Amino acid sequence: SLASRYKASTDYAKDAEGLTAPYVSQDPQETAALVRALDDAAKKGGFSVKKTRYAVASSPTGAEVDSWRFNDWDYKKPDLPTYARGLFTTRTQHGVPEIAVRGYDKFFNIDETRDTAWSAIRERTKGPYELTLKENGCIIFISGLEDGTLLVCSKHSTGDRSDVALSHSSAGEKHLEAQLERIGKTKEELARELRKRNATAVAELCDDSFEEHILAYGPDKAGLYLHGINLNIPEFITYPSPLVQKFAEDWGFRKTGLIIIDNIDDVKAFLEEVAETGAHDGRDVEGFVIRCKKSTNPGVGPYHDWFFKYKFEEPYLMYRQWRECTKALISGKQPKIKKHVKITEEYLLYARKRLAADPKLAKLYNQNHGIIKLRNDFLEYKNMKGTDAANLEDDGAASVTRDIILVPIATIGCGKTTLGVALTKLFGWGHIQNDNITGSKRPPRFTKAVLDELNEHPAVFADRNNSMRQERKQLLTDVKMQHTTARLVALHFVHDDINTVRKVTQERVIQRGDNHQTIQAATDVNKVIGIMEGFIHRFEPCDPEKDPDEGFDAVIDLDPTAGSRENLEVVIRELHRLYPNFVKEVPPAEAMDEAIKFAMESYKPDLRHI
Ligand SMILES: Nc1ncnc2c1ncn2[C@@H]1O[C@H](COP(=O)(O)CP(=O)(O)OP(=O)(O)O)[C@@H](O)[C@H]1O
Ligand SMILES: Nc1nc2c(ncn2[C@@H]2O[C@H](COP(=O)(O)OP(=O)(O)O)[C@@H](O)[C@H]2O)c(=O)[nH]1
C-alpha cells in the first residue's frame, strides 16, 4: 500500500548540503507601495484591512511593528496587494519601511476553493510534492529587526498583554530562549541570521503545559516545530523543506516530518489511505500541508510556490466533540451530542464517574487542561484506539453507491429546479418535479414517483419545496415504509439571512420566472411577491437535532443568496465527502459550468405576471 511505502522523515537536512536558499532583498519602492496600499485600505469606510500597532518590548531602540489583517473572505478576490496571512511592517532607524514578518499565503483544504479541487490541482501544479506533517499548536513567526532584535509574533500579534500571564508570542519567545541556550546560541545571533536571509521563520508552538489542542505534546515533545522559512517580500517565496530541516538543526528547532512524492495521483492515493485511520508511521496525524508549484495557465506559464492542506476528519472531529461535551459537563450545561452518539454517551458516563471520584479534575478542565488525558484514559478503559471508537457508529455510508434521494428544503426561487436539471446533466440522476403533478393525493403520488425513478437511476432529485416540517415527516415516513435502503439527503437552503434571501429570490422569479404552480398562475408582480412571502412565512428551517429532520441520513447546507453555480458545487463536494463511493470524484469546474449553463438555457419558464 502507498501509506506503507512512504514514510515521513526528519532526516532531510543532509540532503540540503551544498544547496542555496532562495533570497530576494526588499525593494524600497515596492515595500513603500505595499504599505501605502494597506494604509489607504485601512482608512476607507471591497478589499478592507485592519492595522494594529505594537511596541516591540525587547527592542533596544524602541522599534514598533504594524500588524495587518484582511477580512478572511478577501483572500478569494484577485484584488489584494499581497496574500500573506500574517504580515507585520516596520521602519528602520533611518526611516525605511520594511516587511518585518511575512507569513505563508492563505491556503485551503481540498475542495474548499476552485484551485484546491483535485481536478484543478492535477492540471495546474507541478511536483515533486512536499507532504509536510501538520502539527497542531499555534503559529509563531520569528524574524530579525535592523537593531538586532529577535522579533517573535503569533499569527497577528506580538508582545505581552496584561490580560494573560503569558501570551502566545511570549510563550514562543521563552521556548526560543531555551532552545538557543541548549545549543550555545543567542537570540541576537538568530536575529542577525534571519535578517541576513531577509526571512521569517515559521514554527508551530506545541506545548500542553502552555495550551492543549488535540494531540498531546508533553515535555518530551514540547517546543517549536519549524515548518517554513519565507522571504520578507510581497510575493510568496518559501524555502524547500530540506533546507527548513537543516535550519531547524542549526538553530535548535524541532523538525516537521516530510515525505516527497513525485506523482500527484500517488499524493492523492496516499492521503486517502492515511485518512482511513488518521495515523501514519505509527503516530496520530491531524493532517498534511502539501507544497508544490502552481501556474495560472495549465501546463505553461511561470510557476509560483503554492500550498494546499489535507485535514483528516476522524478521530479528531469526535475528539473535538468530547472536549466540548466535557466543558458542558463541568459547567452544568447540556452536552451537545451531534455524532458518535453511543460512544460519546459512554465517554460522558466515564467522565462523570472520574469527576465524582476526583473533584479537583474539574478545576483542571476549567482551565482547558487535562482533557486530552481524560480522552486517552477513556480509550484505555475501552481498550480501543480513537479511530476504532470513531468507527463504532457507522451507517454504511462508505459503501453506498445508489438509492440516494435528494430532498430540497427551500422556498420559491432558491434554484431547486435549476440544480436538479444541472445534476441530471452531470450525472444522469432522476428528477421528479412536484410542479408537474396536479389534482388530489399529490404528496403520496409525488413520493411514489420519486421512489420509482430509482428503477433506472442511482439517485433522484425530489423537486418540492418541503418548506413545512410536516412535509419532510411525510416524505421520510413514506419512503422508509416502502424502501428499506434508500438514504434521504436534505439540501437545506438556509434562510437565516432572510431579507437578503427575499431580494435574491424575488429578483430571480420576477425577472426570469418560475414554474411553481402558484407562480405560473400569478398575473402580476404583487401577486408574485405575496405568494413568495407566503412560503417565507410558512418556512420551517431544517433542524437535524429534532424530529422530523433528524430522520435524514445527512443534511447539506446551501445558500439561497448564492448563485446556483456555487450551490451546485457545494452539493457535489458534500455528497462526495459523505458518500465517496456514490460520487467518486467532483467533476471539473468546466463541467459544472457547462451543466449550469445548460440548466438555465434549457429550463426557461414563461412569465405570466408580465
Ligand atoms: N507543515 C505545516 N505547513 C504549514 N502550516 C502548518 C504546518 N504544520 C502546522 N501548520 C499550521 O497550520 C495552519 C493552517 O491550517 P489551519 O489549522 O486549518 C488554519 P485555521 O485553524 O483554519 O485558522 P487559525 O490558523 O487562525 O487557527 C498554519 O497557520 C500553521 O499554524
Ligand atoms: N441569474 C441567475 N438566475 C438564476 C440562478 N439560479 C436560478 N435562476 C433563475 O431563477 C428562476 C427560478 O429558479 P428555479 O430553479 O426554478 O428556483 P426554484 O423555484 O427553487 O425551483 C429561474 O428562471 C432560474 O433560471 C442563478 O444562479 N443566477
In the 3-class helix/strand/coil scheme, how is 400-416 assigned residue by residue?
CCCCEEEEEECCCCCCH
Q: Which grid coordinates belong to 119?
A: 481536478
Element (H, E) at 141: strand 138-144
**Sheet strands side by side (includes 254-255):** 150-153, 138-144, 199-206, 223-231, 254-255
Residue 368 CA: distances (Å) to CA of 158, 208, 211, 348: 23, 10, 8, 17
Atom index in ligand 2 nearest the CA of residue 512 equals 23
DSSP letters for 2-25:
HHHH---BS--GGGGTTPPPP--P
CA 227 – CA 254 distance, rounded (Å):
9
After which residues are there C–N gaps above 2.5 Å in the chain?
45
Q: Phi first, then psi: give them for residue 490, nearest 5 degrees.
A: -75, 135
Q: Which grid coordinates belong to 144?
A: 530579525
CA 592 – CA 103 distance, rounded (Å):
34
Give the Å distance between the CA of 466 and the centre of ligand 1.
40
CA 104 – CA 242 distance, rounded (Å):
17
Peptide bond into 128 cis (omega under 30): yes
Q: Which grid coordinates belong to 284?
A: 496520530
Residue 236 in contact with residue 99, Cβ under 8 Å? no
Which residue spans within 394-508 are E strands per DSSP? 404-409, 430-433, 459-463, 487-493
DSSP helix/strand/coil, 100: strand
Residue 491: name the closest of 438, 418, 441, 546 by CA.
418
CA 119 – CA 595 distance, rounded (Å):
16
CA 406 – CA 432 distance, rounded (Å):
11
577 annotated to bind ligand: no
Residue 244 in contact with residue 227, Cβ under 8 Å? yes
Q: Which grid coordinates belong to 378?
A: 477513556
Residue 293: name the closest of 178, 124, 153, 441 by CA.
124
Distance of CA 23 to the CA centre of its chain: 31
Q: Phi first, then psi: give them for residue 79, nearest 5 degrees.
A: -85, -25
Q: Which grid coordinates belong to 229?
A: 522559512
Ligand nearest to the backbone CA of 256 = 1
DSSP 257: P
Residue 559 in contact with residue 505, Cβ under 8 Å? no
The end-to-end CA distance of the chain, in Å, is 63
Residue 244 in contact with residue 250, Cβ under 8 Å? no
Give the Å distance between the CA of 391 and the centre of ligand 1.
26
Atom index in ligand 1 nearest the CA of residue 138 equals 31
Ligand nearest to the backbone CA of 603 = 2
The CATH code of domain 397-602 reads: 3.40.50.300
Element (H, E) at 68: strand 64-70
CA 476 – CA 363 distance, rounded (Å):
45
135 annotated to bind ligand: yes
Between vectors from CA 313 to CA 310 and to CA 315, what angle results, nearest 5°? 130
Collect all residues with Cβ–Cβ distance below 8 Å to 451 and sequence separation of at least 6.
479, 482, 483, 486
Q: Which grid coordinates belong to 387?
A: 479511530
Q: Give just the sign of the alpha carbon dihedral 58, 59, 61, 64.
A: negative
227 annotated to bind ligand: yes
Residue 220 falls in which region: left (phi positive, over 0), alpha (psi -120 to 50) or beta: alpha
Residue 509: name the closest of 608, 409, 407 by CA.
608
Residue 17 in contact with residue 243, Cβ under 8 Å? no
Residue 414 in contact with residue 505, Cβ under 8 Å? yes
3-state secondary structure 106-125: CCCECCCCCCCCHHHHHHHE
Atom index in ligand 2 nearest the CA of residue 566 equals 27
Resolution of the experimentally solved model in angstroms:
1.9
DSSP 586: P
Q: Phi first, then psi: give them for residue 409, nearest 5 degrees.
A: -125, 105
Compute how many other C-beta atoms are within 10 angstroms of the C-beta atom of residue 535: 19
Q: What share of the chain is helix, strand, coil (3-state, %, to 5)?
A: 40, 20, 40
What pairs with residue 366 in β-bridges? none
CA 319 – CA 401 distance, rounded (Å):
29
The CATH code of domain 2-311 reads: 3.30.470.30
CA 208 – CA 206 distance, rounded (Å):
7
Residue 420 in contact with residue 462, Cβ under 8 Å? no
CA 462 – CA 403 distance, rounded (Å):
12
Residue 489 in contact with residue 400, Cβ under 8 Å? no
Q: Which grid coordinates belong to 290?
A: 502539501
CA 488 – CA 134 distance, rounded (Å):
35
Q: Which grid coordinates belong to 532?
A: 413568495
Answer yes or no: 134 catalytic: yes
CA 467 – CA 411 distance, rounded (Å):
6
Peptide bond into 588 cis (omega under 30): no
Question: What is the pairing mode between strands 125-133 and 258-261?
Answer: antiparallel
CA dihedral 131, 136, 138, 144 (to 10 degrees): -30
What residue spans of 105-186 are helical by DSSP H? 118-124, 168-183
DSSP helix/strand/coil, 230: strand
Question: What is the pairing mode between strands 64-70 and 254-255?
Answer: unpaired
Nearest CA to ligand 1 atom 29: 139
Give the Å distance between the CA of 105 and the centre of ligand 1.
11
Angle subtended by helix axes 442-453 and 469-482, to nearest 10: 50
Give long-range contacts, CB 8 A cutoff, 24+ apart: 266-275.
266/2, 267/127, 267/129, 267/131, 268/118, 269/2, 270/2, 270/3, 270/6, 270/131, 271/131, 271/310, 273/1, 273/2, 273/3, 274/3, 274/312, 275/310, 275/312, 275/313
Residue 180 in contact with residue 192, Cβ under 8 Å? no
Question: What is the pairing mode between strands 138-144 and 150-153?
Answer: antiparallel
Residue 525 in contact with residue 511, Cβ under 8 Å? no
Q: Give just the sign of the alpha carbon dihedral 527, 529, 535, 537.
A: negative
Peptide bond into 315 cis (omega under 30): yes
Q: Which residues line ligand 1 (CB under 6 A)?
A: 132, 134-135, 139, 155, 204, 227-228, 256, 289, 309
Angle subtended by helix axes 589-602 and 564-578, to nearest 10: 130
Atom index in ligand 2 nearest the CA of residue 410 equals 20
Question: What is the pairing mode between strands 279-280 and 258-261?
Answer: unpaired
Compute how many other C-beta atoms are within 10 angstroms of the C-beta atom of residue 425: 18
DSSP letters for 525-564:
HHHHHHHHHHHHHH-----TTSTTGGGSSEEEEE-TTS-H
CA 232 – CA 392 distance, rounded (Å):
48
36 annotated to bind ligand: no
CA 16 – CA 11 distance, rounded (Å):
10
Nearest CA to ligand 2 atom 25: 600
User: Any idea how long the chain is?
Assistant: 610
CA 244 – CA 225 distance, rounded (Å):
10
- Residue to mutate (ligand 1; options 9, 75, 204, 245; most atoms within 8 A of CB): 204
CA 411 – CA 464 distance, rounded (Å):
9
Q: Which grid coordinates belong to 386?
A: 480513537
DSSP helix/strand/coil, 484: coil
- HSE on the CB side for 212, CA within 13 Å? 19
Burial (0-12, 13-18, 19+ Cβ within 10 Å), 346: middle
Give the Å distance between the CA of 577 and the centre of ligand 2.
26
Q: What's at 243, amino acid-wise?
A: L
Return the domain boundaries, the chain: 2-311, 316-390, 397-602
Residue 463 in contact with residue 514, Cβ under 8 Å? no
DSSP helix/strand/coil, 366: helix
Residue 458 in contact with residue 402, Cβ under 8 Å? yes
Collect all residues with Cβ–Cβ distance below 8 Å to 107 and sequence separation of at least 6.
289, 306, 307, 308, 309
Residue 405: name the closest of 263, 278, 552 by CA.
552
Q: Which grid coordinates belong to 149?
A: 532584535
- Residue to mutate (ligand 1; options 83, 101, 116, 134; most atoms within 8 A of CB): 134
Ligand nearest to the backbone CA of 138 = 1
Residue 582 CA: distances (Å) to CA of 44, 92, 248: 48, 59, 44
Residue 432 in contact with residue 403, Cβ under 8 Å? no
604 annotated to bind ligand: no
Q: Which grid coordinates belong to 203?
A: 514554527
Q: What's at 320, amino acid-wise?
A: R
Q: Which grid coordinates belong to 491?
A: 439540501
Q: Which of 44, 50, 134, 221 is catalytic?
A: 134
